[PDB]
Amino acid sequence: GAMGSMERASLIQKAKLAEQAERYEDMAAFMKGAVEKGEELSCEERNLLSVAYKNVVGGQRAAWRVLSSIEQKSNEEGSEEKGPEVREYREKVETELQGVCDTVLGLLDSHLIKEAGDAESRVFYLKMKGDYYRYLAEVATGDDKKRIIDSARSAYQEAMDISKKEMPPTNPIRLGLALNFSVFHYEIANSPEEAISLAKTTFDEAMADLHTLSEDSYKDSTLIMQLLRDNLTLWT
């Protein structure tokens, strides 16, 4: 690791600077370096890690979708043969995306999840594990696709079980986990009814717990509740 000689605190400081500069690849590299120092991550640090890689992989996913769409059109009846280039370049972006996902999954497995004992850390990391297997599933087409899907499902399910036992229904990590697991059901697992049920139950149970919250906590929880509602509106 090229960050091995940099202080942990300096890596975290530079991750925050990279964020302000919208340099998310740098941000991710700094936070990978910080994780590899071997200490547990604080709440702020976990979110720096997640923001960085979410932005990096999000851009890869958007590019992959553009190229996949072009590739699918090149294969319709009537298209002129353009050669191997569209497939090659889609494969290039795909392989880079898989590499980023494997990197994040590797950090979670060595050794963030096994040292995470508090609900807020363990659920956070298991959600990430589900998310990055979900991104692998989005591009998967081979002998391993079912197993990738089941790896996402299993991580999301463990996170869900912990979150229902240990966090209130308005907890933003619990809400975001449910939002994403619901999308997993709809888009990956071919289970739209499960997706809709999960989003609705999550929304309704959160609604009933809003009365316990401060104004600032209310703002955070209702933001994600609105995303649940947005998806329900898309799907119904």
Binding site: D131, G176, L179, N180, V183, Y186, E187, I224, L227, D230, N231, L234, W235
Partner: peptide, 5 residues
Amino acid sequence: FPATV
């Protein structure tokens, strides 16, 4: 696409 966070 649907919303995730």
